[PDB]
């Protein structure tokens, strides 16, 4: 299907063109309470999810899947995707997390919410790693698409579906290497960098699982209400 | 459910 016959450059363009916008937090912005920070983030994540759902539809290969499979992948991947986005946006702000242009939080503001500073620290470490690696926008969009396709693929005939996903994943791998080769990296450097990028995805998975625990923990405590969509996505884990 | 709506829009 369409996705498999795209060139590397066509794949990258498609992914770049699919990028969701950067959203703003609610401006309504004093020193933060636990409940207020929670409220801001919850509201922001909910709005972001709507844009992510529409981004996913523009990822070549994704709409080729059945609705059930698209749902499964999104339910598995959504928090990883929010996280890698956050980490990407925060690259140019060492020591801080750019949740939105009007919501740039440092580590100590992570203490406003109980158990949040752990996840913050992991996110900050990920941002540093991307900076140390000099991650490029074109690489980022590839990684984000890999997360979408990879994260639920092992937990599904639902075999020709798996094969298609694995074929798309192979295409994105080709695209990543292409980009590295164009940037003038040696063969050795290309396979080394590819490995380094993909190994970070293990850490992103870990962060997602910790964040999901945290999110379920805040639901039980009913400290702020979660949106219907967030609760739907959370229920899927 | 909501996911289904948003995926079909
Ligand atoms: N404190 S909460 O109100 O329980 C709550 C609500 C939403 C969220 C969280 C936590 C976790 C905590 C770390 C960020 C993360 C997350 C988030 C929000 C916006 C993003 O672009 C990325 C991620 N959503």
Q: Give the torsion sign (CA, A140, A146, A147, A148).
A: positive
- The answer on whether A89 is annotated among ligand-binding residues is yes
| A48 marked as binding residue | yes
Q: Is A224 in the pocket of ligand 1 (CB under 6 A)?
A: yes
- Resolution reading in Å: 1.8
Number of structural domains (chain A) is 1
Which structural technique was applied?
Answer: X-ray
Return the SS3 of A142: helix
Q: How far off is chain A from B5, nearest CA to CA, in Å?
A: 10
Ligand 1 pocket check for A211: Cβ under 6 Å = yes
Four-point Cα dihedral A106, A209, A211, A20, nearest 10? 80
Q: A164 a known binding residue?
A: no
The Cβ of residue A200 has, within 10 Å, a number of other Cβ atoms equal to 17
Under 8 Å between Cβ of A99 and A23: no
Interatomic CA distance for residues A200 and A206, integer angstroms: 10
Contacts of A120 (CB under 8 A, 6+ apart): A97, A105, A107, A110
β-pair type (A103-106, A96-100): antiparallel
- Cβ of A233 within 8 Å of Cβ of B3? The answer is yes
What CATH number does the domain containing A35 carry? 1.10.565.10
| Cβ burial A25-49 (10 Å sphere, 16+ → b, else e) | beeeeeebeeebbbbbbbbbbbbbb
Residue A184 has φ and ψ, to the nearest 5°, of: 85, 15
Q: What is the DSSP letter of A221?
A: T
Residue owning the nearest CA to atom 18 of ligand 1: A45
H-helix or E-strand containing A73?
A: helix A67-89
Our CA angle for A48, A214, A121, nearest 5°, is 80
A86 Cβ inside 6 Å of ligand 1: yes
**Binding site membership of A143 for ligand 1 (Cβ less than 6 Å):** no
For A233, the domain range is 1-237
∠ CA A199-A200-A202, rounded to 5°: 70
Q: How many CB atoms lie within 10 A of CB A24?
A: 13
Looking at chain B, which residue has its C-alpha nearest residue A55? B7
Q: How remote is the CA of residue A182 from the centroid of ligand 1, in Å? A: 36
The conformation of residue A101, written as its DSSP 8-state character, comes to T
**A2 C-alpha to ligand 1 centroid (Å):** 35
Which residue, A128, A131, A133, A123, is CA-closest to A196? A133
What is the distance in A from the centroid of ligand 1 to the CA of A183? 35
Reference A23, options A4, A45, A42; nearest CA is A45
């Amino acid at each position: 299907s369409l996705a498999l016959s795209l060139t590397a450059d066509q794949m990258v363009s498609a992914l770049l063109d699919a990028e969701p916008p950067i959203l703003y937090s609610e401006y309504d912005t004093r020193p933060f309470s636990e409940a207020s920070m929670m409220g801001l983030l919850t509201n922001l994540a909910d709005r972001e999810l709507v844009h992510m759902i529409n981004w996913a539809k523009r990822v070549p290969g994704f709409v080729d899947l059945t609705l059930h499979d698209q749902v499964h992948l999104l339910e598995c991947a959504w928090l990883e995707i929010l996280m890698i986005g956050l980490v990407w946006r925060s690259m140019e702000h060492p020591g801080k997390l750019l949740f939105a242009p009007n919501l740039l939080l440092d580590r100590n503001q992570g203490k406003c919410v109980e158990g949040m500073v752990e996840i913050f620290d992991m996110l900050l470490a990920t941002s540093s790693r991307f900076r140390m690696m000099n991650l490029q926008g074109e690489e980022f969009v590839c990684l984000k698409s890999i997360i979408l396709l990879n994260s639920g693929v092992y937990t599904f005939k639902s075999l020709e579906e798996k094969d298609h996903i694995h074929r798309v994943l192979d295409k994105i791998t080709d695209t990543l290497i292409h980009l590295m080769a164009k940037a003038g990296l040696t063969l050795q450097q290309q396979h080394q960098r590819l490995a380094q990028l993909l190994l970070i995805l293990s850490h992103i998975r870990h962060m997602s699982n910790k964040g999901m625990e945290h999110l379920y923990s805040m639901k039980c405590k009913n400290v702020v209400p979660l949106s219907d969509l967030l609760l739907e996505m959370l229920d899927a884990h | 459910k909501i996911l289904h709506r948003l995926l079909q829009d």
